[PDB]
Ligand binder design. Structure first.
Ligand SMILES: O=S(=O)(Nc1ccc(O)c(-c2c(O)ccc3ccccc23)c1)c1cc(Cl)ccc1Cl
Length: 210
């Protein structure tokens, strides 16, 4: 049912640096997640050129931002290419094809955490604002999976069946008590306008029911 894995040592070290480094400019987390979504959307768009059946799991190419003050979550949804189980475990749990090593060296030599996206590890900036991250994903060649981690060196993967998404990735950010500014409509719009105004897919900010 639930499988537990260790992060590769360098990934756990990087996460600990993000959790533990004093750094006020936390808002860049949202840019880095939107940018991974946009990348995943380019890839499905590209594939569907030579095989239009890749869109049978959904034609719309977009990014949805879903704040929920009651649950204290901000969720980033995209309809990009998604990840298989193996891709999820490698992509989130190992250095894989990222510049994890170069980033940690860079911060020692004067880079700052705002530059994390240059090294293909921008995802982990989620831990600037979230105590826990859940990544739900569905690739055309696999079943739906949920990855989850509150850091501390491990993560879990299980199958996810309540709510099939079609195709793509949802990142759910269980925000820290002091990071609820990122559920405010005004704050979200400001950050999207500041850092993500050129993304080439519709970004829809959901309104809250209460
Ligand atoms: O080039 S990618 O493989 N693109 C890609 C493909 C499918 C995906 O579902 C995603 C993706 C998303 O669509 C959304 C959030 C993600 C968070 C961490 C890693 C990948 C995410 C990104 C990739 C992989 C990694 Cl580990 C980090 C960034 C990127 Cl752009």
């Amino acid at each position: 049912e639930v499988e537990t894995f260790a992060f590769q040592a360098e990934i756990a070290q990087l996460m600990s640096l993000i959790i533990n480094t004093f750094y006020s400019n936390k808002e860049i987390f949202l840019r880095e997640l939107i940018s991974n979504s946009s990348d995943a959307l380019d890839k499905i768009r590209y594939e569907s050129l030579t095989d239009p059946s890749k869109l049978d799991s959904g034609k719309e190419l977009h990014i949805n931002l879903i704040p929920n003050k009651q649950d204290r979550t901000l969720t980033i949804v995209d309809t990009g290419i998604g990840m298989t189980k193996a891709d999820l475990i490698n992509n989130l749990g190992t250095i894989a094809k990222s510049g994890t090593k170069a980033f940690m060296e860079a911060l020692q030599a004067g880079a700052d955490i705002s530059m994390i996206g240059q090294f293909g590890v921008g995802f982990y900036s989620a831990y600037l604002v979230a105590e826990k991250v859940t990544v739900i994903t569905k690739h055309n060649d696999d079943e739906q999976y949920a990855w989850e981690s509150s850091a501390g060196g491990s993560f879990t993967v299980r199958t996810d069946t309540g709510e099939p998404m079609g195709r793509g990735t949802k990142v759910i950010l269980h925000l820290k008590e002091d990071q609820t500014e990122y559920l405010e409509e005004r704050r979200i719009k400001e950050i999207v306008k500041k850092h993500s105004q050129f993304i080439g897919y519709p970004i829809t900010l959901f309104v809250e029911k209460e």
